Design a protein around this ligand. Structure first.
Ligand SMILES: Cc1cc2nc3c(=O)[nH]c(=O)nc-3n(C[C@H](O)[C@H](O)[C@H](O)COP(=O)(O)OP(=O)(O)OC[C@H]3O[C@@H](n4cnc5c(N)ncnc54)[C@H](O)[C@@H]3O)c2cc1C
Length: 296
């Protein structure tokens, strides 16, 4: 009781007896779009998310919009907010300003990311090179005042695939002080489960690990998400969408809800409840996620 931190994603995760979700949002490009998203976020608090996240454009391209939205959400929603933060190709002063502003706004969680590969200005010659460089820097500068998350790849990272290679780098990130891990999206439950077994044996028996999940909002959008993330779609899932279903968008969406429910239930059962938190890539949409949560 004495040591519990009510704003820490790690402490909140372990304290839960029952399973739960988290939600990732992005900053809209207009003020009207931002007002509308805040209304949507307010409605989605009825799904009882453990925390919400706000994405960050590589190289600082959305710095002001991300910082503003994360702070506004933290102040008004009464839910912990985790701000994403990429480190390559950005001046140290921008990273320092972002962390200072988060700290002063009451934000106590950061998802520490590389972003794109490092690159300079050739002969005109950027001190962060990998995500681990940012994890170490945050912990040096703030200790446990920030609970720090990092990214993982059950099917391996691909530059714009070897999951064992990335497990080596993931271990370095955890040893440097990462407090939780969120995965790239996947549709093959067995790729996630083999990864989770390797994570427990080689990295940590207890660290919070969230599968990242992308709803199926149309047949074409589903295929596009898998293409961009380099995630495989198993034959057993593809067979649920024969041509007569593919042509019927309402049927695709309904079957898509069932596939996500089944994925979640299989993970919870097969891991004996070790995996009790499920992270959704919302793309600022509510309906599919509300059905997945209400029908489960
Ligand atoms: C949950 C989640 C949220 C995300 N949010 C965003 C976002 O808001 N904005 C955005 O731009 N991107 C985001 N990304 C994408 C991410 O920035 C890219 O996948 C990026 O290419 C790698 O980031 P990382 O932090 O996993 O990098 P790292 O863990 O640094 O690894 C990336 C690669 O760097 C190399 N590497 C790492 N460490 C070492 C080492 N010690 N020695 C040698 N080589 C090494 C490896 O080749 C490795 O595959 C997100 C990803 C996830 C899973």
């Amino acid at each position: 009781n004495l040591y519990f931190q009510s704003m820490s994603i790690r402490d909140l995760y372990h304290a839960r007896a029952s399973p739960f979700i988290s939600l990732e949002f992005f900053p809209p490009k207009t003020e009207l779009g931002t007002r509308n998203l805040m209304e949507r976020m307010h409605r989605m608090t009825a799904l009882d998310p453990l925390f919400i996240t706000v994405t960050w454009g590589a190289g600082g391209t959305t710095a002001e919009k991300t910082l503003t939205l994360a702070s506004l959400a933290q102040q008004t929603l009464n839910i912990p907010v985790c701000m994403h933060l990429t480190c390559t190709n950005t001046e140290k002063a921008i990273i320092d300003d972002a962390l200072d502003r988060c700290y002063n706004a009451g934000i106590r969680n950061i998802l520490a990311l590389r972003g794109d590969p490092p690159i300079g200005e050739d002969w005109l010659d950027s001190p962060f090179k990998y995500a681990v460089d940012l994890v170490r820097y945050i912990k040096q500068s703030y200790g446990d005042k920030f609970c720090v998350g990092v990214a993982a790849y059950p099917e391996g990272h691909c530059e714009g695939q070897d999951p064992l290679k990335d497990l080596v780098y993931l271990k370095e990130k955890v040893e440097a002080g990462a407090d939780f891990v969120i995965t790239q999206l996947f549709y093959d439950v067995e790729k996630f489960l083999t990864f989770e077994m390797l994570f427990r044996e080689r990295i940590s028996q207890d660290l919070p690990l969230f599968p990242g999940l992308m709803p199926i909002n149309s047949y074409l959008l589903f295929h596009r998400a898998a293409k961009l993330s380099h995630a495989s779609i198993p034959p057993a899932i593809l067979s649920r969408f024969p041509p007569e279903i593919q042509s019927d968008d309402n049927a695709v969406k309904s079957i898509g809800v069932d596939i996500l429910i089944e994925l979640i239930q299989e993970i919870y059962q097969r891991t004996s409840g070790r995996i009790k938190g499920f992270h959704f890539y919302t793309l600022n949409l509510e309906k599919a996620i509300a059905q997945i949560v209400s029908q489960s």
